[PDB]
Design a protein around this ligand. Structure first.
Ligand SMILES: O=C1c2ccccc2C(=O)c2c1cc(NS(=O)(=O)c1ccc(Cl)cc1)c(O)c2O
Ligand SMILES: [Cl-]
Lengths: 233, 234
């Protein structure tokens, strides 16, 4: 009867969550920060305790985790960060709003990318304003040329998140360690897809709420014994 | 030089203000303490410091100081390792008492002696102490053996349990070329400084490390400083 909690960060600065923020290291907006505080407050009111926390290397998820740990008085917990829990890399679309994306690539192609599980957007090229900012960021300096994405389909995102789940998170859960994961929509999709054994179509329709603790009760085989629960009013 | 090490004592706590002995009590930063840590971080940012790994205690005044620094230098993504071994000295029965209550109960003479002694501990925190359960039964210490969980510490005891972490967990990282940041407490950092500079018991007790100011060491490959520590800031 292992217990697992996931939280998806809230709003990021400059409307970036509506602009394919992806691997660009946008901070939380004050509103996104307040959401995290409400979620942490919900975990406290419910008396939740953790033994270890996992997050991405992106500050919007990390600050979400910090806000939560602060709210529940568990700032002393071990924290593990990994690029593998990063948001999906949206390639050349990173930073563009809906109108700019449509104008640049056309409604037909945008619809195809939106509904596809395995078609990536175009690569982020050297002329992209974020190209050097992301690709040469020191935090990814140890990644092999294979590992560092120029773009990702949802399938690619899920493919690189799962090995971390299996090799680092699973063992902790099986040891009775109470895990908290603070990450992004698409990396959490990968975990939820594997947990509940959803299909590609189903995972693409799943939209995890932000700033709300997501609770899983898992059996001995790390299979959910009930549907995901949310904490709050 | 071969290596660079940065140390920082946590910013002023809410109890530093009230002049109460915190020790292992988990007092938070005061608003001023938070501003100190932020200034420290800005100094590190202005000088272009980059780190590869951070160490801190399990006390929030040090952790929050580290968080504030990492935020200021845009390195929130760094791996962070927390250990009770970098905790502040455990002040035993003095925990929670202020200056007046301490002199009232123990006399100025005894206080003088504790103050100037390297190896004499204050009285033990016993079960009837009002902070006994709050500290002694905190689950963050659940994995400590019976003899690791102190009821009180001399400065010698503190340094004695800090240095093993330094030698076993931090030294190898430094020699691996990792640029280390340690955000901790006056007395746990004293142990590190004493070992780096091979200082005498009296010299280390005269060393006052200021809250929230980054301290830089330039080290040779054997981790010997090539010059005096430098304070970073305005
Ligand atoms: O009583 C102690 C003391 C007691 C036992 C071990 C170490 C110390 C110690 O190191 C110390 C003390 C007092 C003061 N000055 S004091 O204004 O009386 C004081 C008191 C308590 C606190 Cl929290 C702060 C200041 C100092 O400057 C010290 O370095
Ligand atoms: Cl952290």
């Amino acid at each position: 009867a292992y217990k697992l909690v996931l939280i998806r960060h809230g709003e990021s600065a400059w409307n970036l969550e509506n602009r394919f923020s992806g691997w660009y290291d946008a901070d939380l907006s004050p509103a996104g920060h307040e959401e995290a505080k409400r979620g942490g407050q919900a975990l406290r009111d419910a008396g939740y305790e953790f033994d270890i926390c996992f997050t991405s290397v992106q500050k919007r998820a990390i600050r979400t985790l910090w806000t939560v740990l602060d709210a529940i008085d568990q700032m002393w917990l071990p924290v593990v960060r990994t690029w593998r829990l990063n948001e999906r890399h949206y390639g050349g679309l990173t930073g563009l709003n809906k109108a700019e994306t449509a104008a640049k690539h056309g409604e037909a192609q945008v619809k195809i990318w939106r509904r596809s599980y395995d078609v990536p957007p175009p690569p982020m090229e050297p002329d992209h304003p974020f190209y050097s900012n992301i690709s040469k960021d020191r935090r990814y300096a140890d990644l092999t040329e294979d590992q560092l994405p120029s773009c990702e389909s949802l399938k690619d995102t899920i493919a690189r998140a799962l090995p971390f789940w299996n090799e680092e998170i699973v063992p902790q859960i099986k040891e009775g360690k109470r895990v908290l994961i603070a990450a992004h929509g698409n990396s959490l999709r990968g975990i939820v897809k594997h947990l509940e054994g959803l299909s590609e179509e189903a995972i693409m329709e799943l939209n995890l709420p932000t700033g709300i603790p997501i609770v899983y009760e898992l059996d001995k085989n790390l299979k959910p014994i009930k549907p995901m629960q949310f904490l709050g009013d």
